[PDB]
Amino acid sequence: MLNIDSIIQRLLEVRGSKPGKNVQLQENEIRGLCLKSREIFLSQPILLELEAPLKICGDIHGQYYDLLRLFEYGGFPPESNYLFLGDYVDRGKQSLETICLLLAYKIKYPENFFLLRGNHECASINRIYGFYDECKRRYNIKLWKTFTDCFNCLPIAAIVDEKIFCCHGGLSPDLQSMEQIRRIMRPTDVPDQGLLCDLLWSDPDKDVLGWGENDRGVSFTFGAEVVAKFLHKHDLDLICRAHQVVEDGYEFFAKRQLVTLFSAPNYCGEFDNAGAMMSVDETLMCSFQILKPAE
C-alpha cells in the first residue's frame, strides 16, 4: 500500500536546490512504485488510445532537474496531461529520481499520465549505460531486477485522436496492422530484431529510399516515402517519436509528416542541444516549448 502523495511530495521538494541533490526514498517505496505501476500498465492497452489536449515529451535520460523544469513550464500533473516517449534512465546522474517521479504520477493519475517504453527500458541496455550502476550504488541489485520486471510491461505506442502515432524509435517493415502491436504479449523483453525492436530502435533517414541498415547496429532506417505510405494506409497525419538527439529539441522529417522530440538538454554534457516538449491542443494544433542550455 503506497503513500503516493508522500512519495511525490518528497520527490518535488528538491525543486530550487543546487542541481544534483538526491531524493532518498525507501527501498520498499521504490519497489511499491514498480509493483503498482506494473499492474496499471498491464491493465491498460499496449497500444494507447489518447485524447488531446496533452503534452508530449521525448528522452529524459535521468536528467531529473530538467524533468522538473519541463513540469514547471508545462504544468504539474494533472494540470496538463502527459505522454512520455521512453528513455527515462541511463546516461544522466539521477535516473532513480526520474523514473520514480514518472511512475508515481502514473499511479496517481493513470488516465492523465502516460509512459511508453524506450530502448533504454531494457535490461541488456540499462545494465551497461548507467541505471544498473545507480541502483547497485544507492540500493541493491534486487531493486534493479524489480525495475526490469516493471519496464517489461510498459506500453509500446500510442495514437492521439486517431491521427498522431507515437513511439520511441520508429516504423517497422514488419508492421502492416496496428493489431500486430496489440497482440504483443507482456511482460516481454525487447528482441534483437523484429517489430518490437524496430518500434523502439529505428530512425528516419533523408538519404535512404525504402529501408536501410541502421548505423546504430540495431534495426533499420526508413525514408520519407515509407512515412507517407504509412500515414496514408492508417489514415494518420503525423508520426511523433524520440530516440535521436536533435539540436533544437524537435526536428521535422518528410515535410512535417514526422517529428522527433528529445527532452534532455545538453545531453551527456556533450551535445549542447535544446530539449523540447510538444503541446497538442484539442484541435490537434501542435506547438513547441524548448529548453535551451545556457552557461
Binding site: 542541481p19 530538467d66 523544469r69 513550464y73 485522436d161 486517431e162 491521427k163 498522431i164 497525419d237 503525423l238 512535417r256 538538454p265 535544446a274 484541435t283 490537434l284 494544433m285 501542435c286 506547438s287 513547441f288 516549448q289 524548448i290 529548453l291 535551451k292 542550455p293 545556457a294 552557461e295
Partner: peptide
C-alpha cells in the same frame, strides 16, 4: 480533426 502546427516557438533558457 487535422494536425496543424503553430509557427511560433516558445523558448526558455536553462542557465548552468
Amino acid at each position: 480533426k487535422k494536425v496543424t502546427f503553430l509557427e511560433e516557438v516558445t523558448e526558455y533558457y536553462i542557465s548552468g
